[PDB]
Amino acid sequence: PHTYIKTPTYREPVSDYQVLREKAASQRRDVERALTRFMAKTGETQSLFKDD
Amino acid sequence: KIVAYELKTGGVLLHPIFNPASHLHFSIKHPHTLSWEYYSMFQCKAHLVMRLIENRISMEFMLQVFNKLLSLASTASSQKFQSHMWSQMLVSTSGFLKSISNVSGKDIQPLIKQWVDQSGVVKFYGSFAFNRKRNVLELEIKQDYTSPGTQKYVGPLKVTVQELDGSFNHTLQIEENSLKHDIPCHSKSRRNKKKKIPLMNGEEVDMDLSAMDADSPLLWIRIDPDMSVLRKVEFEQADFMWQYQLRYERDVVAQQESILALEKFPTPASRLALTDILEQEQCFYRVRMSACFCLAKIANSMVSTWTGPPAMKSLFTRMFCCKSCPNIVKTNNFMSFQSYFLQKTMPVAMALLRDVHNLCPKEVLTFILDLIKYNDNRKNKFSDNYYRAEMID
Numbered sequence: 001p002h003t004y005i006k007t008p009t010y011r012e013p014v015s016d017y018q019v020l021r022e023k024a025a026s027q028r029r030d031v032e033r034a035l036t037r038f039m040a041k042t043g044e045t046q047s048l049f050k051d052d
Numbered sequence: 053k054i055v056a057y058e059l060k061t062g063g064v065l066l067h068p069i070f071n072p073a074s075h076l077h078f079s080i081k082h083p084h085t086l087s088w089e090y091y092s093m094f095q096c097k098a099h100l101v102m103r104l105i106e107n108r109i110s111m112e113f114m115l116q117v118f119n120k121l122l123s124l125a126s127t128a129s130s131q132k133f134q135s136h137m138w139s140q141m142l143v144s145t146s147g148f149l150k151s152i153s154n155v156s157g158k159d160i161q162p163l164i165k166q167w168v169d170q171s172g173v174v175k176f177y178g179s180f181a182f183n184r185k186r187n188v189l190e191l192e193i194k195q196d197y198t199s200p201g202t203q204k205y206v207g208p209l210k211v212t213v214q215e216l217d218g219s220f221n222h223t224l225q226i227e228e229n230s231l232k233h234d235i236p237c238h239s240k241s242r243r244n245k246k247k248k249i250p251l252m253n254g255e256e257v258d259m260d261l262s263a264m265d266a267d268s269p270l271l272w273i274r275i276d277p278d279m280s281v282l283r284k285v286e287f288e289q290a291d292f293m294w295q296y297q298l299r300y301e302r303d304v305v306a307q308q309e310s311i312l313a314l315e316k317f318p319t320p321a322s323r324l325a326l327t328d329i330l331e332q333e334q335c336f337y338r339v340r341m342s343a344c345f346c347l348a349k350i351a352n353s354m355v356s357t358w359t360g361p362p363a364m365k366s367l368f369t370r371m372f373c374c375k376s377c378p379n380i381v382k383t384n385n386f387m388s389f390q391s392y393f394l395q396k397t398m399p400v401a402m403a404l405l406r407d408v409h410n411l412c413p414k415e416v417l418t419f420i421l422d423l424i425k426y427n428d429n430r431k432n433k434f435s436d437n438y439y440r441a442e443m444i445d
Contacts, residue, residue, distance in 0.1 A: 018377050025426050 054100065055284045057093045058173045059201040064090065064097045065171035067145055073171060075200070100282065101167050107280050108163055109156045116155045121148070162207075167282060172203030178275045179288040182237070182268040189213065189270060191233040193226060204228065205281060211235070212277045214296075215269040216242040216261075218250040240269040253302045263292040263321060272297040274306055285309075291317035295325040307339045311346045318353040323363075326350070330367060330394075337390040344394075344401035352406050362416050364402050371395075379419075381426050386434040396442040399423060 014020070058064060062075035070081055079085045086094070106114045121143060128140035153159045175196040182189055191211065197204040209224045217238040224233045242249055243264075248256035249271070264271065272293045275285050289297075294317065298310040307329075314322045326343045329335055344364060351363040360366070369378045372395050386392040399420050407413050424443050429436040 017374070018380065021377070021380050021426060021428075024428070029425060 054093055054097050054282065055173045057089070058171075059175075059199065059284075061201075063171035063173070063201050064093050066094070066098055066101060066168045069169075097282075104163060104167060104280065104282075105152070105160055107278070108160055109152065109158055113152075113156045117148075117151050120151050120155065166203075166205075166207070170203055172201060173282040173284065174205040175199065175202050176275055176283055176285045176287075178273075178285065180273055182265075182270065183234075184267045187237050188234045189237050189273075191224070191235065191273075191275075192231060193224070193233065193275065194231060195226075205283075207281075210276055210278060210280060212252070212274045213237075214252070214271045214273075214301075216240050216249055216271065217269065219252040237269055243269075249300075251300065251302055255302075257300055259296065259300060263295070265290075272301070274303075277303065277306065279305070287313075289313070291319060291322060295321055298325050298329060304336045304339055307336070308342060311339065311342045315346055315349050318350045320354075320357075323347065323350055323354075327367065330364070331371075333390070337393055340394055341397045344398050345404070348401040348404040352404065355406070355408055362402065362405050362413060364398055365416065365419060368395075368398055368402070368419075372398075379422055381423055383428040383431050384436060384439070385432045386436075386439070387432065392434075392439075396439045400442055400445050 054064070062073065065073045065080060068080055071079060073080050076090070078087055078090070080090075083091070125141040128137050131137040149159065149161070149164065176193055177196065178191060178193045180189055180191050193209070195204060196202055206227055209226050211222050211224055213220055213222065213235065215238050217240075220238070222235045224235075226233075243261055246258075249259050250256040259271070270293075272289060273287065274297075275287055276283055291314070294310045294313050297306055298314065301307055301310070311326070311329075314326065326347045329343045330340050330347065332340075347363050351358060371391065373379070373381050402416055403412060403420060405413060405416050420443065424440075427436070427440070427443075
């Protein structure tokens, strides 16, 4: 029945609470790190260390 | 607060007579020469002495005193005579004591003479011994009255003894030459049969009596339980008595003082007592918040004996994390207001853990950083600023 019949398939769904918590956490941390580095680079900046 | 301030520098003198207080570097004749810490401790001591006057003369008579003062003032407040009657709106000490004596028939002049006119707090050092032969409890209460902030107490003193037959109150007369006070003790027939031991309130509980002495019935002793004097108590119980007082007492100040006294006994039974307090809802939440820091101190003192994980970590994952993921914290729902306070105070105490090398372990620091990363607050009706601020702490 490659010759007379057929049926569709789908992509593998990731319904796991652990990896969904990890994905949302890491994406939130990365976007807030990118935002704060962009705003500290395009403005007046301070530094805990000398010339940092 | 007041016993710390009065033992630190001199004492607060309510109602001075015009210097009356020369132990301190400012003059107490005017409010604008007082130190600000003295002003704060003045208001604090004034409301505690009013609680003492309520203890001697009951609360309904106290509210009748206040209503009589307000009623004289409000009959005064409507006249037009220029102060023939407008000075009934001004209270004095003699007028207040006279109104108290009018409504109650008792005068409080010894209590006023001790706690108002005299400027000192008392220090109690207690130690007991149980006489098995005559079945008595020999208390030994001595006062430190030679410190700069202290004074000598000669009144009566309440003591509450929890024995196997229940909770009994005793009044002791502590004169100047007194040292040994023999009070009688009851049976120990609730160790013959397993019966429940009745508490300070009407209830009764099952206690594990394996830690108790075989010859003594008494489970714990509390000197001045109702805080009826301005005092600092230093009682010498045994560590199992402090653990029984932490577990089964129905008074929050006794649970707090047993937490404070269990830091000197780092035995694993005290760790079990504080961990059972921490796991226990229907305990007052500010006792569990103190048991966190007490458990951290005890855990720091019994390194090279601690068996499993660091303290409170497994308990945090049992109470506040997911069942399927132990290292992922649950999403924030702060609607309980007691597990919110306990959740935001438990890593702050957990970070005071130290290893054998005096460095914080990388299992607790990693746990705190995972608490910070996996924090999701898009679902509760409350803000997250104090919990995140405590995470930084």
